[PDB]
Design a protein around this ligand. Structure first.
Ligand SMILES: [K+]
Length: 108
């Protein structure tokens, strides 16, 4: 039942996986975490389930669909991604909750 804060950067799937690909960024960070033997705390989530929560209805309406998000418990990384990607929005939410039972779930 204990909840934690998740930070995210949100954009259209087309932008993240086509226009401004983030594969190399995530590959690099994952590599660094490995040599540092650090637990992964960031995830690429296509059509994120948190976006379906009732409270995210306006944010979803505003975001071109299909959407994709990079979620992390590290706020600084997410803010940097905003500076790095630009054509995106960022925010945070607490989970797991009744409306967001699976914070990292992808709905295809
Ligand atoms: K939309």
């Amino acid at each position: 039942m204990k909840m934690q804060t998740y930070y995210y950067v949100l954009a259209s799937r087309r932008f993240l996986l086509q226009e401004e690909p983030i594969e190399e960024v995530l590959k690099e960070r994952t590599r660094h975490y490995h040599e540092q033997e650090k637990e992964i705390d960031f995830w690429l989530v296509p059509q994120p389930a948190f976006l379906e929560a009732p409270e995210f209805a306006d944010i979803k309406a505003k975001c071109p669909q299909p959407a994709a998000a990079i979620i992390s418990t590290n706020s600084q990384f997410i803010t940097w991604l905003k500076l790095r990607l630009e054509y995106v929005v960022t925010g945070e939410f607490s989970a797991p909750s009744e409306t967001i039972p699976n914070p990292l779930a992808s709905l295809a």
